[PDB]
Ligand binder design. Structure first.
Ligand SMILES: [Ca+2]
Length: 447
């Protein structure tokens, strides 16, 4: 096993070695302290093996800085980037860092860990809608991992992290864990998501991406923090803090949403979970002080397509009926329930809303097209805890009244929140980046 060391004056030789395919398992490409400007088109390829990846890393964590024009493609097996700081770099074209070489030649078992992407905005792209688009990280292939990274201050349109699916490469089992997705200011239009899993056109395909133990801090570009657009993904134990958007099951089916926590601080645009499409299981989520919606269950325009469906007549970009969704053991604290809104004639069917706590000061419960929507819900053994003890009796729908029991405000909620936040923030991100430590300390001291 060999270490190959380079300095900023050696960018040409560095790019050649990384892109040659000649690196062997256990080898490392090591960058001495400095700023590496304008790498431009750079490939990282090779074949590591399990337990012996090929590594591209800083000699001293955080002191190798990559800036300027960049088009990095990663493809091969068991390749790892570690401890790199991407600062004021930007994409030559659409994609700054991509896990594919030529179309069809993918990364697998590759990993980006303890890296930062901060302020990586093309000066020649604009900050307003339609003034330019660039994506920071594109996942392709299978079994790749993004972990313990910090991504913040994207100011141009486009995704922080896109999971790309195709008809012949969709089932990925990628893992996105222990990352800190920091501030994103309002974009003023669509296309400023943090994570997008698939696309409308790939949304009927199984992805099996796992998004676990991540922090989203002031992610406020648009109404979707995470836009789930594919099937069988798992979103677990994430923290959404002061973020002006929601976790949205936008397209695709059978997504599993477990034990996430939302701390909105009553800020503009903060939201919880938005449900479109079928088959999801939504368990143990805790949604607090969000102002747009706590839970939204939408009508659909079309049924889920079959092989016979002409998707030119029933587009995948539309909205598909909610059916067969289990919503159990969640908490909605000073956060609304909005059931049956949206355009379309496909009412929700077979939605179970059971064992949830709906609590706060004044309840915010919105039911649309009640006599057509409520038959599609089973409300069972929920708890209702609000200041006015007459409030449940004032609800117009007996089926709703019978599905809730009034209770006094439970006394363990502050401790429950502390456990959830403590579990998410003290193992997140790269420890060497001061802004990660500062932002984590902010959450810790402003719960
Ligand atoms: Ca969007």
């Amino acid at each position: 096993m060999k270490e190959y060391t380079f300095s900023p004056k050696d960018v040409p030789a560095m790019k050649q070695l990384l892109g040659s395919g000649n690196l062997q398992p256990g080898d490392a490409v090591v960058l001495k302290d400095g700023t590496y400007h304008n790498l431009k088109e750079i490939n990282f390829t090779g074949k590591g093996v399990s337990g012996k990846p090929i590594v591209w890393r800083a000699e001293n964590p955080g002191k190798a800085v990559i800036s300027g024009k960049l088009r990095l493609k990663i493809y091969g097996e068991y390749l790892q980037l570690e401890d790199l700081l991407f600062y004021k770099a930007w994409a030559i074209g659409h994609d700054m860092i991509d896990f594919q070489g030529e179309k069809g030649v993918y990364a697998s078992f590759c990993r980006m860990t303890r890296c930062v992407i901060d302020e990586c905005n093309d000066p020649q792209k604009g900050e307003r809608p339609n003034e330019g688009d660039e994506y920071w990280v594109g996942l392709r292939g299978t079994n790749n991992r993004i972990d313990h990274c910090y991504f913040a201050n994207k100011r141009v349109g486009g995704l922080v992290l896109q999971v790309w699916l195709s008809a012949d490469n969709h089932l990925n089992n990628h893992l996105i864990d222990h990352n800190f997705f920091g501030e994103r200011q309002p974009y003023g239009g669509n296309g400023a998501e943090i994570i997008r899993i698939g696309h409308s056109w790939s949304s009927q395909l199984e992805s099996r991406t796992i998004v676990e133990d991540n922090v989203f801090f002031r992610c406020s570009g648009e109404n979707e923090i995470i836009s789930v657009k594919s099937c069988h993904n798992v979103l677990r134990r994430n923290l959404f803090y002061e973020s002006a958007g929601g976790l949205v099951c936008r397209h695709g089916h059978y997504n599993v949403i477990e034990s996430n926590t939302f701390i909105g601080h009553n800020l503009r645009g903060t939201a919880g979970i938005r449900i479109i499409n079928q088959g999801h299981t939504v368990y143990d989520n805790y949604i607090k002080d969000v102002r747009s919606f706590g839970l939204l269950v939408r009508v659909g325009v079309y049924e889920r397509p079959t092989a016979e469906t002409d998707v030119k007549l029933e587009p995948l970009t539309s909205y598909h009926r909610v059916e067969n969704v289990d919503i159990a053991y969640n908490t909605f604290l000073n956060s609304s329930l909005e059931l049956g809104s949206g355009r379309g004639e496909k009412m929700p069917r077979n939605v179970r809303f059971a064992h949830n706590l709906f609590a706060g000061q004044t309840p915010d419960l919105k039911i649309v097209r009640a006599d057509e929507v409520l038959p599609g819900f089973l409300f069972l053994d929920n708890e209702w805890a609000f200041s006015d003890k007459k409030s449940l009796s004032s609800v117009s729908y007996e089926q709703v009244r019978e599905g809730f029991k009034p209770v006094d405000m439970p006394d363990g909620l502050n401790q429950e929140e502390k456990e959830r936040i403590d579990a998410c923030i003290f193992t997140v991100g790269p420890t060497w980046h001061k802004a990660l430590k500062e932002n984590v300390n902010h959450i810790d001291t402003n719960r």
